[PDB]
Structure 1
């Protein structure tokens, strides 16, 4: 139900081997680790969770943009990109969190489908 896709606006390519961490907000308002991985050669990270586990709640997707740029020998602005949203059962069932990265800028969009 959750996929993350990352693109590099400088090179016009997927952003490969980017670390991504997902957290779920706990009842005490802290962020608890939920799932993680590294984007593939296609810039995608699949397999993070299951329908059973991805219950309604507030989630945060943290994308390690700084390490990505540093590996390319480029100084970037942000520490990371963070995407924070509520998962809602009464909306479509599949969430794609997309991010488009530049050194001093990023875009993120949610594509929510059935």
Structure 2
């Protein structure tokens, strides 16, 4: 749909599968409120988290439980989890892909905003 997540493992060089992803929308009260969640698939992807009709402009936060994932491989991670806060103001493009590359002591995240 209009919001996709992709997670990869930099240690094994494979998609990070079955990771818990939680999405939040900043509400007026300025707190974070549940929006959507899921666990990444076998190809380290999470789709159809939302629809265009309910994905309105605003501030969203995507939180990835990197800790649980690393513990499970029996590796001691640094981060409690990874977060990505961005303003989604679909004024042009439509699709957003939040990609994160994980390592026990580091993680990189990039956003690919396209139109088709």
TM bracket, shorter-chain basis: over 0.9
Alpha-carbon offset, residue 77 of structure 1: 0.1
Which structure 2 residue ranges, 5 or more long, are not aligned? none
- The corresponding residue for 2:45 is 44
Q: Output the TM-score relative to the length of structure 1.
A: 0.99
Once structures 1 and 2 are overlaid, which stretch shifts more, 84-93 or 9-18?
A: 84-93
> Could you give the per-residue CA deviations for residues 22-54 of structure 1, whole angstroms, max 9, x where no partner exists?
000000100000000000000000010000000
Q: Is 1:35–2:29 an aligned residue pair?
A: no
> Could you give the per-residue CA deviations for residues 50-98 of structure 1, whole angstroms, max 9, x where no partner exists?
0000000000000000000000000000000000000012131000000
The separation in 2 between residues aligned to 1:92 and 1:42, in whole angstroms, is 25
SS at match of 1:68: helix
Which structure 1 residue ranges, 5 or more long, are not aligned? none
Aligned length in residues: 114
The separation in 2 between residues aligned to 1:4 and 1:65, in whole angstroms, is 14
Q: Output the TM-score relative to the length of structure 2.
A: 0.97
The separation in 2 between residues aligned to 1:72 and 1:61, in whole angstroms, is 23
The separation in 1 between residues aligned to 2:68 and 2:32, in whole angstroms, is 22
